[model samples]
Every structure is written in structure tokens, then in C-alpha cells.
Target: HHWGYGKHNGPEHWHKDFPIAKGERQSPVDIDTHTAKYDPSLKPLSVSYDQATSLRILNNGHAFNVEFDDSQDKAVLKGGPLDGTYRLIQFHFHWGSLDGQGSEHTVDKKKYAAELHLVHWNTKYGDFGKAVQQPDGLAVLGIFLKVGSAKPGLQKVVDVLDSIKTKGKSADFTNFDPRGLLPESLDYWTYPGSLTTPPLLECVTWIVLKEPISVSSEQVLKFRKLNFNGEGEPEELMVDNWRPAQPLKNRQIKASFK
Candidate 1:
């Protein structure tokens, strides 16, 4: 059976299908600042993206992803905890229920209203599908979403939610740079972890930005409007799509800033 973010097929039940769900180096762990080692040697994060590379947006039943044209070096993430350049593939968000607590990774045990993930694949791995099987195959940038002024760049994304209101629906989305959605400070906490979703491969280098970008409550509700079901299926509002914080185990969270 396929995996989902519900009581029956949620994170707790993921291990029943994907054994690696319970594996070491699982993701979305709580970041304990005191325990995070300050690594001055960590390079400053460098991101280069071309707005023209943006192709389309799709509601993949899980999240609404803004897919990019990755056939070239138009978009890439480098520096920081990364060893080399990682090509941008897509970006998506995970949100909570109407109660406002849906972030996968937390800071000091505090969850945010939502979290944005810019998923990239290491170029050395050939492609994202192959990278999923390597130790250092993927690099994901996690940014928290706080309730405040609406981010104009983000509104461009939000405006398209109506076009993809149902699962599997898609629309032409162009000229969007994912970098514009990032927080001003690139200082972040990094750690070795697995993808929070199915397969749960321990191949990701998580770079979670310390600062959160702003979004209004109304903008958040717009995300919740997208239905998890497609076509004629029973409708269900997509919310609380985040996985709970897994155990830290023996892993150490490293901070790029003092």
C-alpha cells in the first residue's frame, strides 16, 4: 500500500511499509541549540537560481510542488554543509491543522505554522532518483513559516493554489525564483537525516534556516484549501502534513553560525 499523512497511513505506520522509517538518521528532529556544535568552518550557503527555469506547479496529492527545469545549471544550491552543487528540482510546503502547528523540524521544541522544503539532488549522483540511494545524495533547505506580513514572492505561489485545488492537478507556473522565498539570513543548523516521507532514505543533508519567512494567516488558509483527493473522490482538506520529530539517536546537529 502507498503511504500517506493520516491516522491509518501516517508516520507511525510508515515503518510497516518502509523499514527505513525506523532507521537511524531519521529526519525532522528537534534542534537543541546547546547541543549543536558551532562549526566555523562551514561555508556560507550560496544559492543561484534563474526565474526562467520555473516550469509548472503540481498538486502531487501530498503537497503542491513548484517544479523547475533541471536539465541545465539554471538553479543550484552550494556551500554550507554541502560538498558540491545540488540542482534544484522542486519546492513544496507542509502545513498543520487549523490550530497552527505543522512544521516537521522544530527549534527548541517549538513548531511553526508551516515549513517549506526546497528539494535538490547532488549532481554527482546523476539524477534525483539515483541520489536517493546514496549517502550524500540529497540536500534539502528547510524554512519555517511564521504568521506576519504576507511575503509578496510567496503570494505568487499562493495565488496558484486555486489552479491546483485537487490532487494531480497542475498549471503553468513560470518566472519564479525559489531563492526569493528564503529568509534574509543564511545562518542555519545542519544534520544528517533521511527523507521524512516514504522510503525514508538516509541520504539527505538538512540545512534548516535559523530565521523564518513571514506569511499571513489568510495565506496559510489558502494552502489548506487544496484538497487531498482528486477528480470525483471524497474531498479531504490537506493539513497537518508534517511528520513528527523523530528521535535524535546518536546524531549531532551542527550550527553554521555562532
Candidate 2:
């Protein structure tokens, strides 16, 4: 939550936590899209629902991310979360610095223990990597994960994290339904932004949900056990790998209910 166009610790401060991101086009971008005007005729699109993954669970111990490869599906919307269908490319997680909170996007300046990013595209780009290069070819669906008493449908994902403690290792999960993990309402906040990580293309549409999903203390504990080791650095536990906040830079964040 300590990101955005503040006096300091903004996009300019990303190098402190992730030195590599400093060179990338960071998020909370200032919307300077060349489009002549808001194109009301521009309808959103998404990938075919079937194109997504059944279950892609990786055993990193500290945190596990399962994504639906909805790239093959067409993006569409009937006045829901998105304006149209957005092809889902990959999904990942952002955790806090400690046991408390460290998500990228904040609600009323509030941060969560963790956050899930389901990366999608506007289908304008024929490919995932290529889509990242275009200014409007990407869409990121964000869900805030908080530690609580309720055991979420996603808890099943963490239950298996213990099975794959080592890095570069994975297992297959069956009978998984992605819709179950999403919040009840697709209503969201939309804005023009960029990627939070390296190669941060400044061309992305971000959708942030107002409501957060909850998981039990046990699930949080499970994610705490995961790890992603980098060169020479100590085995970085996956608890809080989130980048500090970036800049909004004269950008307008619009809520869907409007």
C-alpha cells in the first residue's frame, strides 16, 4: 500500500525492493493513451472460457498460484467486471514483507496479507509476450487475499503446497473449478496502468475488485512455507514478495458501478 504518486517511496522507489523493476515500465501509469477520445464503440473482449487451465498448482511452499489459461477463449462482458472478454495469460501472487500485509493496489490506502493477479489481454495482441508490449493489450484481474477465520475454496490449493516444498517442482491437481475462487460479483475498478514487475510494459488495463476474499490462518501458514530461491540471496520465503507501490501519475481509476 506504500505505493502511488506520493512524495517518496513511489514508482521511483521500486529499486529498493526489486532492483530489476526500476528499468521496467512500472504500474499505476499516467494515462496518456494516444486514442483521440474515449471510444464508446470500443467493446471489451476476453479469451474463450475453455481455453483456461484446469489447475496449474506449483509447490513453492510459501505461496502457490493456480491459473486458468483462458487465452484461447474470446473476451466478452454484459456489463460485468470487464467491458469485454480478456484473454487470461498467467496468474501469480504478491505477498507482504512479513506476516501482515503488502499487496500492490490499495483500497483506501489499506493493504492485505497477499494478493492474486490473474493476467489477461485485450485480444488485440495475438500472443501473450507480444501483448505485454502494446499499451492497451493487457488486463490484470486483482483479488486481495486476507488472513481470517473463513476457509476459502482456494484453501484446497494451499493444502497441497506442502507436497512440493522444493523449487522447480510441481504436481497435477484435478476436479478444479476456477469460478469458485473468484468473488461473487465481477464488479471492479478499471484503470490504465502497467505491469508491476520487470519488462513492465506501460500498456495494461488494470481491474481491481472492491471486495476481498478471505482464507483461514492455516492457509496463510501454508503459503508462508513456500519459497522461490534467487541467485546468492538467502532462500526467499514466499511470504511477502510484493513490490512496493508505484505511481498513479495523473491516471483516473474508475469503478465499474459508475
Candidate 3:
């Protein structure tokens, strides 16, 4: 339960508790564009999000996540190395205290300010609890956030940070259209990988966008305003909440464009 980004409870210590930490098919692999194989067959990712289906935003300690109402097919991800529709469950970020390094997945060893993950579950598995254990049960669409001008799309989430500054805190976040967060080009890389976080389930089909969206430097600083410690514990600033790139063993990353 002490798994965190701190020096003591960080990722290096995760294998002590969860053995899958060093397993094959681990996520957040570095993408070397020159070596990655390009497949023209990969279809364009089709995304449809319903603003009304969003539930709330919360500081889960590890990251700030915006929950979605996954009861039905209100919001979903289709295509791009996927065989069927995957329902959106939640979207969150992995960021740092500084602008130079934070994103979990890197491009040619280059890190962005942050990374946004849109998590979805396969309908074939019935429920998220059951789906989480299947190899083809999840799809995580990743977008790298570079520090530049303020992205109005992300500001909506940033504006509500104060309300959920403490761990386990959540507030209603509705009418939020996730589609606006997409980069101009949907060119991406796909691979079979595991969850970047604990339990680190190897059930994800990672579709990482090649293009990066912009977020201001000061805006990312505001993200660190959240506290990993909840009400009872001494407050610790939530920062560098990202896992480094794991080994890309026995895996071939496929790009959607040539």
C-alpha cells in the first residue's frame, strides 16, 4: 500500500510487492521512430465522447483523474489496432514538478511535460474488474503534453484543481468533451503493453499519439499544487508521478503512418 513516487516507495521497490513489475509486455516503452515498424493497415482511431457521461474529477494521490460513467457505450474508442469497441472508463495524467521531465512514455529518449492516459475497457469482458485481467481487455490512448501555450481544453480540468487538492477528494466534472484534447494529427504507435501503474496488469493495447499537445509551464506548476497525503497525514506535494520506460522485450511497436 505504500507504493508511491517517493524515493523509498517508488517504482524500483514495486517488484518487491508486485512481481509483475519486471514482467514482459510492460508499458511506457521508449519509442525509437527509426526502429519502430510502420503498418499502413492500421486504421485511424475513431473517438466519440459524450460530455454528459463524465462523472467527476479526483486526486487519487498518484494522479488527478476524471471519472466517466461507463455504464453503457456513451463514450468509446474504436479502431487503431483494436478489434472491437472499448468503453471509456477514466482519464488521468502522469506529470512532474518541472517541465523538462515527466511523461511516462518518451520519444527517442525525449520526455514531455506530462502524459495523459484515456483508459477504456473491452465490452467482451462484461465488467472492468473482469476485463482488467484479459490481454486484449483494455485500450489506453496516450497523448504527450509539451510545455508551450495554454491548451484551453486542459485548462477546464486545471481550473478545478483547488477543489480536489487532497488525496481521495473528488468533485463533479460534467459536460466535458474529451475530444478537444486530441492533437491535430492522429498518427500514433501501437503495442501490446501492461498498465504503467501498480498491479501493472498486462492487459492494454497502448495507442500513443505521435503529435503532442501544448500546455503552459505555469499550468503544469499548478498541477503540483495537489497533495499526495490525505487529511490525516502530513501533506506531500504530488510530483514526478511517472514511471520510467520499461524494457521493450519481445515486442514490436507498430506505427499507424509510414
Candidate 4:
């Protein structure tokens, strides 16, 4: 059966097919700054990427992702709770129907308009498909999106949406640096959480940025315009794709800065 954000197959009922949905380290937790521990030893993130590494962009039904060629060490994430270099595989976003309350990870129970996830995998474990199963296998950088001024770099991504408006549609997207999307302050809250998607593997080392990037209301509306279904199928607006915040359990969240 196909899984979606609908009441019938949403996050609430994921346990039927993927039992790990109820695991101890489920993701999209509500982060409280006061509750997080300040870590002086937490190194600043070292993000290095080659614009050439960006290959194509596609809508995979769940979200629109910009896939990269991770075969080489062109784009890699190091330091900041990572033991080794993790290759950048792809990046995607989650949003709501209108504007507010869309981000997957919230801060003190406050929701933002959208959220961006830059997915990477441990090179020591080879490909992403294999790395996802092992602990310390993946490192995801979470950037919150606030409704404000138009983000020039983000517009490049939004410009391609019309081309890939339907599921299975893709187009060549290159010379774009993912780092441009990050905020000036790299200060983040680090925790251990699972993928917000099904099979919800509890292997991701989440580095959620304390500061949010800006996006115009018009640009955000473009995201809501995309279709979940392919051409010739019933049209379904792809909005509110974010998963709800899960329990933190006994996990300790670390802060890169005080």
C-alpha cells in the first residue's frame, strides 16, 4: 500500500507497515533551547561542495529533491558530531498548504513556514542506501524557513518547480551551491533522531540550525502548487508534508554555541 500524509496512511498509522515508526529515536522533535546542553567541544561544521556536483531535480511524490552525484568526494560534510566525511546525496523541503506551521522540526513547539533538509551519508559505509541502516550513517542539516524577504538563492530552486510540477518529472539542475541556502550563523542543536519518512530509520545525526533563512510568501506558494500525482492521474496538492514532532525520550540535545 502507498503511504502518504492523509488520515488513512499518515504518520499516525505508519507502524502498520514499518514497525520502526514507534522506535525510541523517532525524529522531528520539539527542541527547547533552555533544555539543550551547551557544548564547548562541539566543532563548527565544515561544509564543502562543488557546484558541478548538483545533477538534477525531481519531485519524488513526497518532496522535491535536488539529487547530486555522490560517487566522488566533491560535496562532503565534516565535523559537528560527525566522525568522518559524509557525502552529500540530495536535499529537499517540507511545507504547509498556506504559510505558517509547516516545518518538520519545531523550536519550543513553535512552527515555521517550511523546512529544508540537506541529506548526507557516511562515506565509510559506502552508498547512502547502505549507510542509512548503520548508526552514525547519516547527517542531516536542518534549516528552518521563515516567511519574509525573497531569498535569491532559493528562487533558483523554486524556478525549477514548474518543470517538475508532477511526480516522476525531472530536469537538469547544475552549478548551484547548496551552501548558499544556509544562514550566516552555523550555531545549531544536535540530536539523534530518525528519518521523518517511513522505514523511519533511527540513524540520522540531526544538526538543526538555530537561525532561519528567509523566503517570500509568493515563493512558498509555489511549493504548494506542485502535484503529488503524476500526469493523467488525480491531482493532489503537495502541502503539509511535514511529520509531527516526536518524543525526545532520553536523548540529550547538544548546542554548538552558547
User: What's the true lDDT of residue 205 in model 4?
Assistant: 96
- Which window of 10 residues has the lowest lDDT sum in candidate 1? 45-54
lDDT of 4 by residue, 6-110 (tens): 889899989899898888898999999899999988999988875437989999998999999988898888999889899899999999986778999999889
**Candidate 2, 1-258: lDDT as tens digits:** 443222464456656665645444466332222311343433332323432455566644334556454546633222333444466655667776454675877665677887788777766567776777777777787788787766466766777777656565677775555555576665566677777764456767777666778777777777776666533546656555565666554556565443
What lDDT, from 0 to 1, does candidate 1 have? 0.90
- For candidate 2, the per-residue lDDT at 28 reads 38
Model 1 agreement with the true structure over 52-157: per-residue lDDT tens digits:
3889999999889999988877789999989889999999999988636989999989999999999899999889899999999999999999888988889899
TM-score of 2: 0.74
Preferred candidate (TM-score higher): 1 or 2 = 1
Q: Considering summed lDDT, which 10 consecutive residues are worst modelled in model 2?
A: 28-37
Q: How well does model 2 score by local distance difference test?
A: 0.60
Backbone atom clashes (below 3 Å) for every candidate: 0, 31, 0, 0
Where model 2 places Cα greater than 4 Å from the true spot, the runs are 1-25, 28-52, 59-64, 69-71, 74-84, 97-99, 230-234
Question: After superposition on all CA atoms, how large is the RMSD of candidate 3?
Answer: 1.1
Ranking of all candidate structures by their TM-score, best first: 4, 3, 1, 2
In terms of lDDT, model 4 sits at: 0.91
lDDT of each: 0.90, 0.60, 0.92, 0.91
Error of 2 at 142 (Å): 0.5
Error of 1 at 91 (Å): 0.3
